Amino acid sequence: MASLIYRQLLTNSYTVDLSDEIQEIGSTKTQNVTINLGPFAQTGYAPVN
Amino acid sequence: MASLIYRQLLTNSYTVDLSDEIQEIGSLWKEMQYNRDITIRFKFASSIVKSGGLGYKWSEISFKPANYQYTYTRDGEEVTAHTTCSVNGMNDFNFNGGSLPTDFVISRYEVIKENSYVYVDYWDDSQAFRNMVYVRSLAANLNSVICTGGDYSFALPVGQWPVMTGGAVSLHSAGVTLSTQFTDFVSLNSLRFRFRLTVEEPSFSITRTRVSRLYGLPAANPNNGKEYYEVAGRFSLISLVPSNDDYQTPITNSVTVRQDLLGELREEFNALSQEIAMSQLIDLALLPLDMFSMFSGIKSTIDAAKSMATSVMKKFKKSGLANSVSTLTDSLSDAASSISRGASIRSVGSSASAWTDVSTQISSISTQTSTISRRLRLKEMATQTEGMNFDDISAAVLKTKIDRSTQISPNTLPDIVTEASEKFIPNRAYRVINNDEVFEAGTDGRFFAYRVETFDEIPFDVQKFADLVTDSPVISAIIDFKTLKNLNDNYGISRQQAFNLLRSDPRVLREFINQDNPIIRNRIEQLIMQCRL
Amino acid sequence: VTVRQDLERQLGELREEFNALSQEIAMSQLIDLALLPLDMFSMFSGIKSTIDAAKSMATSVMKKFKKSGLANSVSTLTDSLSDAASSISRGASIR
Amino acid sequence: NSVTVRQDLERQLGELREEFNALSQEIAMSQLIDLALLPLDMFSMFSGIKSTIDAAKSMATSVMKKFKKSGLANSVSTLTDSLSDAASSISRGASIR
Amino acid sequence: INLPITGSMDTAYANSTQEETFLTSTLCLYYPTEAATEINDNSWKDTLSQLFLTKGWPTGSVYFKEYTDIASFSVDPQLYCDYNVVLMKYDATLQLDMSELADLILNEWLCNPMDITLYYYQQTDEANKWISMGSSCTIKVCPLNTQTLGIGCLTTDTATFEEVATAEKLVITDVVDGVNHKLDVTTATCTIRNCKKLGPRENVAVIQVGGSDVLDITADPTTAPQTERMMRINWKKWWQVFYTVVDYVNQIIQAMSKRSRSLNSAAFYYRI
Amino acid sequence: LPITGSMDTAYANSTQEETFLTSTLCLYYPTEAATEINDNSWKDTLSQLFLTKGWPTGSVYFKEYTDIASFSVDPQLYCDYNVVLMKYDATLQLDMSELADLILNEWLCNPMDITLYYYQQTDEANKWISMGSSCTIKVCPLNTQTLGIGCLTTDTATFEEVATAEKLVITDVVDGVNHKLDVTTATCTIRNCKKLGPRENVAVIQVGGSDVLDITADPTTAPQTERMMRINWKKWWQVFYTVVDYVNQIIQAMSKRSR
Amino acid sequence: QNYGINLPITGSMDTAYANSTQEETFLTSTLCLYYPTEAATEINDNSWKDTLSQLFLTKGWPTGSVYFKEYTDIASFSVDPQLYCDYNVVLMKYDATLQLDMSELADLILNEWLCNPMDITLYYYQQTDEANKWISMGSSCTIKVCPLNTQTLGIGCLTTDTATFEEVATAEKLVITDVVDGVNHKLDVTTATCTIRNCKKLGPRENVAVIQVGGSDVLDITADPTTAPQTERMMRINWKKWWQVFYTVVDYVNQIIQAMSKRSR
Numbered sequence A: 001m002a003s004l005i006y007r008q009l010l011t012n013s014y015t016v017d018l019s020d021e022i023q024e025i026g027s028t029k030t031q032n033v034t035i036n037l038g039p040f041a042q043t044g045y046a047p048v049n
Numbered sequence B: 001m002a003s004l005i006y007r008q009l010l011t012n013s014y015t016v017d018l019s020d021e022i023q024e025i026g027s028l029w030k031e032m033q034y035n036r037d038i039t040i041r042f043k044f045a046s047s048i049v050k051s052g053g054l055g056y057k058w059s060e061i062s063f064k065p066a067n068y069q070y071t072y073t074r075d076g077e078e079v080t081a082h083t084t085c086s087v088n089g090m091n092d093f094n095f096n097g098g099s100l101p102t103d104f105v106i107s108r109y110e111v112i113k114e115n116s117y118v119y120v121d122y123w124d125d126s127q128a129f130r131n132m133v134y135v136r137s138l139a140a141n142l143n144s145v146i147c148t149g150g151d152y153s154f155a156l157p158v159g160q161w162p163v164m165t166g167g168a169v170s171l172h173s174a175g176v177t178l179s180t181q182f183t184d185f186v187s188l189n190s191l192r193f194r195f196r197l198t199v200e201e202p203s204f205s206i207t208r209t210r211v212s213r214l215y216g217l218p219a220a221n222p223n224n225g226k227e228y229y230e231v232a233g234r235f236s237l238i239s240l241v242p243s244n245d246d247y248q249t250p251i252t253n254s255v256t257v258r259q260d261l262l263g264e265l266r267e268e269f270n271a272l273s274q275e276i277a278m279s280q281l282i283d284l285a286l287l288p289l290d291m292f293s294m295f296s297g298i299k300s301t302i303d304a305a306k307s308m309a310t311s312v313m314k315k316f317k318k319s320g321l322a323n324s325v326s327t328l329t330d331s332l333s334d335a336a337s338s339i340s341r342g343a344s345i346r347s348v349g350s351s352a353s354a355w356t357d358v359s360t361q362i363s364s365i366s367t368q369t370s371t372i373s374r375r376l377r378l379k380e381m382a383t384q385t386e387g388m389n390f391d392d393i394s395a396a397v398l399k400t401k402i403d404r405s406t407q408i409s410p411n412t413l414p415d416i417v418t419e420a421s422e423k424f425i426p427n428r429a430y431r432v433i434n435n436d437e438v439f440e441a442g443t444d445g446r447f448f449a450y451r452v453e454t455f456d457e458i459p460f461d462v463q464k465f466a467d468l469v470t471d472s473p474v475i476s477a478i479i480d481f482k483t484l485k486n487l488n489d490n491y492g493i494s495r496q497q498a499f500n501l502l503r504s505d506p507r508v509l510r511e512f513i514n515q516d517n518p519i520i521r522n523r524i525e526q527l528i529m530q531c532r533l
Numbered sequence C: 001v002t003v004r005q006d007l008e009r010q011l012g013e014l015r016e017e018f019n020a021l022s023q024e025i026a027m028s029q030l031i032d033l034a035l036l037p038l039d040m041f042s043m044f045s046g047i048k049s050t051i052d053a054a055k056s057m058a059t060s061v062m063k064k065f066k067k068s069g070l071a072n073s074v075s076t077l078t079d080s081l082s083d084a085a086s087s088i089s090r091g092a093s094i095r
Numbered sequence D: 001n002s003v004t005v006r007q008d009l010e011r012q013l014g015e016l017r018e019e020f021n022a023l024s025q026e027i028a029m030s031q032l033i034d035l036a037l038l039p040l041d042m043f044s045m046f047s048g049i050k051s052t053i054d055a056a057k058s059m060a061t062s063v064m065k066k067f068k069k070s071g072l073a074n075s076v077s078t079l080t081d082s083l084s085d086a087a088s089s090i091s092r093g094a095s096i097r
Numbered sequence E: 001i002n003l004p005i006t007g008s009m010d011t012a013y014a015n016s017t018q019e020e021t022f023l024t025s026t027l028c029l030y031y032p033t034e035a036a037t038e039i040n041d042n043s044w045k046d047t048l049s050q051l052f053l054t055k056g057w058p059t060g061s062v063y064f065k066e067y068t069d070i071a072s073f074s075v076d077p078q079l080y081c082d083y084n085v086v087l088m089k090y091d092a093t094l095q096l097d098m099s100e101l102a103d104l105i106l107n108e109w110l111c112n113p114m115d116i117t118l119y120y121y122q123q124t125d126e127a128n129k130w131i132s133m134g135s136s137c138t139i140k141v142c143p144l145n146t147q148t149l150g151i152g153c154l155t156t157d158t159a160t161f162e163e164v165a166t167a168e169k170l171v172i173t174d175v176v177d178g179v180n181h182k183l184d185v186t187t188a189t190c191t192i193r194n195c196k197k198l199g200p201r202e203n204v205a206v207i208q209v210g211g212s213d214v215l216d217i218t219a220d221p222t223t224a225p226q227t228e229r230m231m232r233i234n235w236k237k238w239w240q241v242f243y244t245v246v247d248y249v250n251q252i253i254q255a256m257s258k259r260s261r262s263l264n265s266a267a268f269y270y271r272i
Numbered sequence F: 001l002p003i004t005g006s007m008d009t010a011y012a013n014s015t016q017e018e019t020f021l022t023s024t025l026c027l028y029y030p031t032e033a034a035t036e037i038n039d040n041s042w043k044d045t046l047s048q049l050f051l052t053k054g055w056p057t058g059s060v061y062f063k064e065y066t067d068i069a070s071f072s073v074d075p076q077l078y079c080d081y082n083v084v085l086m087k088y089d090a091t092l093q094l095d096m097s098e099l100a101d102l103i104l105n106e107w108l109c110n111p112m113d114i115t116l117y118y119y120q121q122t123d124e125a126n127k128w129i130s131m132g133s134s135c136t137i138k139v140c141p142l143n144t145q146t147l148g149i150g151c152l153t154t155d156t157a158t159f160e161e162v163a164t165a166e167k168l169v170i171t172d173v174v175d176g177v178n179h180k181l182d183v184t185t186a187t188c189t190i191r192n193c194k195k196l197g198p199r200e201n202v203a204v205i206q207v208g209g210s211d212v213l214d215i216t217a218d219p220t221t222a223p224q225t226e227r228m229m230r231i232n233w234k235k236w237w238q239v240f241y242t243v244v245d246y247v248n249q250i251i252q253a254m255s256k257r258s259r
Numbered sequence G: 001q002n003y004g005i006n007l008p009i010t011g012s013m014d015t016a017y018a019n020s021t022q023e024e025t026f027l028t029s030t031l032c033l034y035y036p037t038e039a040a041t042e043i044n045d046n047s048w049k050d051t052l053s054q055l056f057l058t059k060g061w062p063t064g065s066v067y068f069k070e071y072t073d074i075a076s077f078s079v080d081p082q083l084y085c086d087y088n089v090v091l092m093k094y095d096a097t098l099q100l101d102m103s104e105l106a107d108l109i110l111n112e113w114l115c116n117p118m119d120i121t122l123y124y125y126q127q128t129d130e131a132n133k134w135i136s137m138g139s140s141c142t143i144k145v146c147p148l149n150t151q152t153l154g155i156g157c158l159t160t161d162t163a164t165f166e167e168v169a170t171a172e173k174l175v176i177t178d179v180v181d182g183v184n185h186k187l188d189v190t191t192a193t194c195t196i197r198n199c200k201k202l203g204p205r206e207n208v209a210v211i212q213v214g215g216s217d218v219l220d221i222t223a224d225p226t227t228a229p230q231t232e233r234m235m236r237i238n239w240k241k242w243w244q245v246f247y248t249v250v251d252y253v254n255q256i257i258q259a260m261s262k263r264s265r
């Protein structure tokens, strides 16, 4: 039991590979973040000559 | 234990679903010593797409893959190298001065931050980049670079110019994988690194606007006029060159493999079957050879080491074994629930029990016994047994063969593990003990009733053997009645030894096997030769 | 905007279905089934129709399982055992 | 948006060993023997520890990936390989008796 | 406390007080301006904090109190921390100054004010000295005789008084113990106090960054001791000195022990 | 292996007058001494003097060195008994202490590849020793995710300078953090070295000022060993006659190596 | 004489009450008064100190055991109060606009604070208990705080724009700040003209005695808004002159010193 935790770590060691696959694949298939603009509108000046 | 490994495969089947999800959303031997040095010179590209109107508005300032081809010196030879740099996972900002046609608008422009990742495929005409077809391990230690953005002016035909300036991020090397460059007639195997981005002090800004103190690197001028950015380090790589009798080390790796396609793997197994010993096999058939211990001694390839257990599981949950297990569980559930309209097919026993429901009969007692014994194989990997638990011996043979057999591969071990689990000891017998009266049974339609102390047969009491095998623990027939009686006759046997052989105890089993008892050696050799594939 | 409740009526209908199917259960076969090491596969393969190409059901059930009284009580018990094992100067203060 | 949120340094493993040596001996024995009869599975062992983290990114995997690099696991695999080899055909080494 | 304590030699007790405070320690370095001058960095304090974090000290526990010069630091040194380290540079023309600073901070003092004009003071034991602090302390002393006259000096002509301090900020004066002295001090710019030496201050640690051990903490010339919390280093840069201190702070902290008498901020107690 | 013994046995004869005949002695003196002496046969003289103490003529060697730093640059001490004479200079205190820390103690040294790898110190004895004609070292500690602390992993100007134009350097940094370095690899080679048990075969003799050597980087011990000796001088012939006459004490304070 | 340790004490209930240590504690102790400039101003006498000393001499306190130490104003007194005597008395005038400052003064002197330093440029600080406060001294302290969340970001404030911080003090000579215990705060302070120190309130100081001269009792020593206690050495008087006040103090100096008790630390 309290050594079954070590046995379980050993048994479930395979998930290290799945986690590495996550790390390598998600970073190739991540979607570009899009910002929610503020409630204002970033106006400024007009074209000055 | 050795059946616990099958139980664990079935249990951990739930990871196959997420593994397939990941794969979908994504989409004699020897050893050679890389840990060679490299220097990667690369650069970014940009893709600017302006809108019409008067010329004050842009609709995209985005990144783009960028190739590069150069030459450098290493160990005294000029090597020509080729890089390809791209990015993923960027923040798309936008500026908007108004809806009028004359107000500065950038509807979308990309910036790479700490949540982004850049990929730099690399290649050269050295020997490693043609030898890296079968890799065992890959990892690289490279220095970092600091890439900064330069001045960029927007060509407004009227008024003052907006000046994009600042911005910088630090690339440190974290992660190495394989990839391919696709040419017109052949393909090239390449090595793509992944750098993580760490933002730095210089804050990007857009002059003559309300944008300032904004960190990151945009796509406008990421190179700041620099012809390239240069990292330098070492890449460590191990190979699986299929060499031979210990000379003539290949170069270019000089091989093809079984991808051109089991017909010969079966012959390999049938050649390795009998060479296996018995005492050491029984010593190995008591070990809980969980996933790690079963898949450690395999000197896998870089992809098999990542997906071996899941690879065998995704086929192990497709087989007669798994389907029969699910069928049994569905039968038990529907029997516990359907009682009002109860399935009245048959019940050889006191009352209805899914373990005792004969069906698909395409002697009567022989048929009943075989049909009841075809579910004790499920009892074995349902933990209601007591003895050497034949699937355990099967798994021990499996683990003793797949560590020797040269022909083992990522596509290959899956459905070999399952063909083994399905075709190892097809015919196999079991027993149940009740008040010093043993009732045996076998899937070959044979039954034997007999007393423990004085082996002498008895009429086989069906409707009692079933009532006992349903609930009481079961035992395996490694020491089955025929050999047991031959032994009690010739090699005169004691009460405790006989009780332990009934219980199928490995201590007494291995003690006879070391006492050189041919009436047990022959039986164990029969079990081996049946574990043939 | 965001909702403040959901799924309650469906869960109620399933409550009714369960509290009406309960009585038709049999006892002999239930005792026969209660001695079965019904692992994840054994419990999630024999679903009525595997209705439509479902997600990983083990993960789906576990992400709700580890928020409930059972798991939190397990964690509380383990924490209490560790805290009682840690110190000797407290004097078995749980009475 | 900052320069970066650095991750502060953690410890010197010598000093962490000395923190253990400071918690050398004050464990209760009845309570320890009552604790050592429990299946303290991954959830139970990684839930209560320090009760504060946002990431939660599979620290059981993070400890397993360092667990399967050590003497214990290598010795287990060595033993299994030795058993399978010796069983199948393999010659016993002259030093092995 | 007067009551006794008991013990044993077989036990393995493990039973001891546990409580809380400010967060299990504090530490304060006292470094010269020259160090930050040579370094020329504005993030080195945070660098050293994150280094100490590896040795265990949390973020809000390490502090630095720059001091321009040994004399400036000697002028009212206000130490209020649970551990104090004092880096101190070697200068053969300042031996007495950086031994008086040591005799002041390493040892615990109990000081009473003094009124030079209205009274004539004296010392009782070999631990009752006179410490004077300020900006420029010029002290002069005339011993006296049984009949309240002078000895090689005159009660009226201050020039006849014997000089013991010239242009010093901190002075620790020991005179003959058992005779009445008459004093003349620059009371406008300096304050003098009749102090008594007590058990040592285990909360400070001096680190002579440079030359060999010179500090004679004990005014008597026969001992010339050297304590565990009296360290030496050889230096050519300051970054290496600080990295050394950080790599070996656990030994510094094993050599220092928290106070026993009470809490206080200065280098001496006031008891009127 | 284990070694037993007893207290009833008797003391054996004096290994002196045989260790002298079957061992070698090697003095390391500065050019200042040869200059002040201004003689060509002083070596023959001192060897003929040693010949009275018992050291034969082909056993004593004199290995001049122009300066303490030029000596500290790769000192190849290969003799069965080594004596070093070291002048005192406050401006050279740390250099003449590092020389002691290098020769008196025996170092297990591995090489170092800065440009490709980042290193850390494990224990209090795993230090970094750099030798060459002019070393200029700078160090940048890192965090768990390879980011700099008060420095930038690329910008060498932001690094922390610990040595400047030093021919020998012994660098101890915080033990447990990964550092990046910048060193004049052209002119200086740097090794990662663990300090083993002391070298009982060399004897430093400081010809001038007070005892300043602090071998122990930890500022708590400041130990003074048996073979770290001192002399006060106004000439060099007196120093050499003192060495000659009290060589037996020096060779009793030294003990032949075990490795 | 085991200092640095704390041992079980024991006694009995049959021992008799010993003699009166009064008329000896007065001789082997010292008494320091702290009056305001307004008192000597109203008085306009040069020998009032010798007068009060010759009066104390009747009560038992000898001539050179009494000390008077002036202070122009309550805030100038709050600026680094250095009370080093064996029995301190502090006569305090009432002003409804100065209530908070003359309560902070009380919470600072009546109690015994264990004070560690603070450096704002490097760290971000949090409180651990309800008695771990931040006391700021100086000539003009302008203190602003920005609490942070779990991920080191402000709450209604930005970690660059100091104007968005939350203000708790504005040009105060003494401040005592308590904030939410469990959250890290970023601080802005006038370090040049003010020192801030993170202090833990230990048990009280039984060596000082505050005497309010005017208005009703208002001093809330305990920062928590539940107790509002009135300690034993927290005295009140009603005044129209100062000679009457000094005569009252002198005539009832024994009750004062009975309410006080020589320190422990």
Ligand SMILES: *[C@@H]1O[C@H](CO)[C@@H](O)[C@H](O)[C@H]1NC(C)=O
Pocket (backbone or CB within 6 Å): B274, B275
């Ligand atoms: C057949 O197997 C035996 C033992 O299993 C071995 O000794 C023999 O060499 C094998 N035959 C051949 C031709 O290799």
Ligand SMILES: *[C@@H]1O[C@H](CO)[C@@H](O)[C@H](O)[C@H]1NC(C)=O
Pocket (backbone or CB within 6 Å): C088, E013, E014, E015
């Ligand atoms: C300390 O605790 C142990 C076990 O809790 C006990 O045996 C021992 O007597 C205690 N110490 C003392 C001094 O009582």
Ligand SMILES: *[C@@H]1O[C@H](CO)[C@@H](O)[C@H](O)[C@H]1NC(C)=O
Pocket (backbone or CB within 6 Å): F013
């Ligand atoms: C040791 O010395 C004594 C007296 O000098 C001498 O008699 C003896 O022979 C010596 N030992 C040996 C082994 O010669």
Ligand SMILES: *[C@@H]1O[C@H](CO)[C@@H](O)[C@H](O)[C@H]1NC(C)=O
Pocket (backbone or CB within 6 Å): G018, G019
């Ligand atoms: C205690 O007080 C009584 C009554 O005043 C007095 O007689 C006695 O002498 C006092 N004790 C001492 C020791 O003086």
Ligand SMILES: [Ca+2]
Pocket (backbone or CB within 6 Å): E096, E097, E100, E168, E169, E170, E171, E172
């Ligand atoms: Ca002085």
Ligand SMILES: [Ca+2]
Pocket (backbone or CB within 6 Å): E152, E153, E159, E160, E161, E162
């Ligand atoms: Ca005179």
Ligand SMILES: [Ca+2]
Pocket (backbone or CB within 6 Å): E123, E125, E126, E127, E128, E129, E174, E175, E176, E177
């Ligand atoms: Ca004296």
Ligand SMILES: [Ca+2]
Pocket (backbone or CB within 6 Å): F094, F095, F098, F166, F167, F168, F169, F170
């Ligand atoms: Ca040097």
Ligand SMILES: [Ca+2]
Pocket (backbone or CB within 6 Å): E247, F121, F123, F124, F125, F126, F127, F172, F173, F174, F175
């Ligand atoms: Ca070190």
Ligand SMILES: [Ca+2]
Pocket (backbone or CB within 6 Å): E041, F150, F151, F157, F158, F159, F160
């Ligand atoms: Ca720097």
Ligand SMILES: [Ca+2]
Pocket (backbone or CB within 6 Å): G100, G101, G102, G104, G172, G173, G174, G175, G176
């Ligand atoms: Ca105030």
Ligand SMILES: [Ca+2]
Pocket (backbone or CB within 6 Å): G127, G129, G130, G131, G132, G133, G178, G179, G180, G181
């Ligand atoms: Ca509070």
Ligand SMILES: [Ca+2]
Pocket (backbone or CB within 6 Å): G156, G157, G164, G165, G166
């Ligand atoms: Ca605000």
